Design a protein around this ligand. Structure first.
Ligand code: MG
Lengths: 107, 107
């Protein structure tokens, strides 16, 4: 019932790092959660979205899973995405990237 | 498997290790070795999840703990230095604790 991290790399994984400032951080979080609620979760190939707020106030991290990297990229290229992503770029210079999960262990 | 929960049952660290393509696999190898030989045996350890950016410029460790204090205790322990010193030779890690504020997954 929850997003799961596993090194089979069945999914593509993006870790988007949005550096911020403490006074902007919650506004940035709210915008990202709105995008997920209203746009991102409905994209073809979407698997999961997981928004993390740094306790020190300087960073937001969006951990998102997709069937293929192309599904995330298609979303970013879609002009329909601009109403949701434009205010985010007003607050932060997001650093987006795909990752391989090369090691996962749980107790 | 490691699960992302908006209940924040566990503490979450997202440790960011900037690097460069020629160093990245050596860094990954040293981080995974530390996980298998040291981190996973620490009190309070819940999970370790090492991610290698496809572009060669970053390694991200998503690790879960009983309490933030358990991770901090490991970092402060001089017994960790043989595993962690070679990593610091490759990268200036930016580590920090996070709150999971939003999670969603397809069914
Ligand atoms: Mg191995």
């Amino acid at each position: 019932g929850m997003a799961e991290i596993s090194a089979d790399n069945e999914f593509a994984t993006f870790i988007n790092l949005f550096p911020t400032k403490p006074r902007d951080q919650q506004k940035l979080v709210d915008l990202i959660v709105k995008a997920h609620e209203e746009l991102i979760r409905h994209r073809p190939g979407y698997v999961s979205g997981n928004v993390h707020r740094s306790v020190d106030g300087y960073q937001v991290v969006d951990y998102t899973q997709w069937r293929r990297r192309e599904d995330f990229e298609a979303m970013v290229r879609d002009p329909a995405s601009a109403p949701h992503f434009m205010p985010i770029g007003e607050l932060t210079q997001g650093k987006q990237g795909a990752y391989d999960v090369v090691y996962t262990h749980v107790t």
